[PDB]
């Protein structure tokens, strides 16, 4: 199938530039403009520009021309974009995007994975793990919610995996909020009493932004 | 530059029910006989997808539940029926002049039967106790709708602040949400009291669901 598979994200002090990709597979890259959009946590949808890859031209958006530079690499049928002068109000999720349909006003028929953004100056920090189990002496009832709290890290994401994805369907993921300029979510999953204990139950934690993994065990206290 | 303001920004529809989503440009978006005004479906977490172009085309693999409609300046998407994995935001954009413009999305929500939460509270672990650090945390889970008051009490008198809130987006299989509601106190804080609730105030009950525990044991 046509795939755009953008770059990971990106922490990037104020002032300084980022630059991004854009990968097109499942047609001729030549064959396509290339638009970028911008979407800023987690609402509002804005176009960037347009590249002609094979040719080209490109063209910006007027409120986007200090700011946004775009690229091709025909070669390797990768998209560019770059972004100067970084503020907090480029923190924000870059998609790129397909062209479709015969002509210049063509809609966006594919979009790429997009790439985060965070324009801060807080340093890259790995989370403090900690487990969530009954409890004091006792469970209560007939299901029982267990959980990792994930803490003070910087940036955003984690992925928090339990009994490296065994559990799945009962799991929920808390989005992350800012406390002290460092992160906090949590995640919980939901198993029967009758299998716990006796029945361990793991989460992973990763921050790739650290390279750190973390396992911890539901003991019981 | 061409506005479209998008109506609702948020709307409650029920499974088998019709969702109507509106979209009004400050320019006529027509030319060529054509109107250039495409729909996107973005589940969060997710890319945009596209579901209409000029108005009214279903793209492939988008099924026949989605449809567009208007000319000019007016156009409507319907969703019928609705199903609980609709769940979205859906945005209108116009591209018949540069730059291309959005509309500031429409939040769909899946309307459906009050559900209490299943709460669930969880003192400082060891572990984060031996950093100096103590939060206390209580899980809130699958309940409906997503309004509800969670309370912290610490031997009684209630405390704000160091209360982080936070939900998930509605399930897309069970319409429900969870919420988890952190307490942060130092260890010091922490070690001087001795009962914690976490009580949740929702809309199935006049009456609060608590949650407790006592340090001491
Ligand atoms: C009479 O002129 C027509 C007619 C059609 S039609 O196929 O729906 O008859 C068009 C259908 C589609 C058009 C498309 S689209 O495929 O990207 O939606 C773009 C343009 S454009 O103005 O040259 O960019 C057009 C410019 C003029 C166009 C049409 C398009
Ligand atoms: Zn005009
Ligand atoms: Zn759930």
């Known amino acids: 199938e046509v795939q755009l598979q953008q770059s990971g994200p990106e922490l990037v002090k104020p002032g300084a530039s980022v630059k991004m990709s854009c990968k097109a597979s499942?047609?001729?890259?030549?064959?396509?403009?290339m638009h970028w959009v911008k979407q800023s946590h987690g609402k509002s949808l804005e176009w960037i520009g347009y590249?002609?890859?094979?040719?080209?031209?490109?063209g910006y958006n007027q409120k986007f021309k200090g700011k946004a530079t775009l690229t091709v690499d025909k070669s390797s049928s990768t998209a560019y974009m770059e972004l100067r002068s970084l503020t907090s109000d480029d923190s924000a999720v870059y998609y790129c995007?397909?062209?479709?349909?015969?002509?210049?006003?063509?809609?966006?028929?594919?979009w790429g994975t997009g790439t985060t953004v965070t324009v801060s100056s807080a340093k890259t920090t790995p989370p403090s793990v900690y487990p969530l189990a009954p409890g004091c002496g006792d469970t209560t009832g007939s299901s029982v919610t267990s959980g990792c709290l994930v803490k003070g890290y910087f940036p955003e994401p984690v992925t928090v995996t339990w009994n490296s994805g065994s559990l799945s369907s009962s799991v929920h993921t808390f989005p992350a909020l800012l406390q002290s300029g460092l992160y906090t979510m949590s995640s919980s999953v939901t198993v029967p009493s009758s299998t716990w204990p006796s029945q361990t139950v793991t989460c992973s934690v990763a921050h790739p932004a650290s390279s750190t993994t973390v396992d911890k065990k539901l003991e019981p206290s | 530059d061409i506005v479209l303001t998008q109506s609702p920004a948020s709307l409650a529809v029920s499974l088998g029910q019709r969702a109507t989503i509106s979209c009004r440009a400050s320019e006529s978006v027509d030319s060529y006989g054509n109107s250039f005004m495409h729909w996107y479906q973005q589940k969060p977490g997710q890319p945009p997808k596209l579901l209409i172009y000029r108005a009214s085309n279903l793209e492939s693999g988008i099924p026949a539940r989605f449809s567009g409609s208007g000319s000019r300046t007016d156009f409507t998407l319907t969703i019928n029926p609705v199903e609980a994995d609709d769940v979205a935001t859906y945005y209108c954009?116009?591209?018949?002049?540069?730059?291309?413009?959005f509309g500031g999305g429409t939040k769909l929500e899946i309307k459906r039967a009050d559900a209490a939460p299943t709460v669930s509270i969880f003192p400082p672990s060891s572990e984060q106790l031996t950093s100096g650090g103590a939060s206390v945390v209580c899980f809130l889970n699958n309940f409906y709708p997503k309004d509800i008051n969670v309370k912290w009490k610490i031997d009684g008198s209630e405390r704000q602040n160091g209360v982080l809130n936070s939900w998930t987006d509605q399930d897309s299989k069970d319409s429900t949400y969870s919420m988890s509601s952190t307490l942060t106190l130092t260890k010091d804080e922490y070690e001087r009291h001795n009962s914690y609730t976490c009580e949740a105030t929702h809309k199935t009950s006049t009456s609060p669901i608590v949650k407790s525990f006592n340090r001491n044991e």
């Open positions: 590249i002609y890859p094979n040719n080209g031209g490109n």
């Open positions: 499942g047609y001729t890259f030549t064959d396509y403009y």
């Open positions: 995007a397909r062209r479709g349909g015969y002509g210049i006003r063509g809609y966006f028929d594919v």
């Open positions: 954009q116009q591209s018949n002049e540069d730059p291309r413009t």
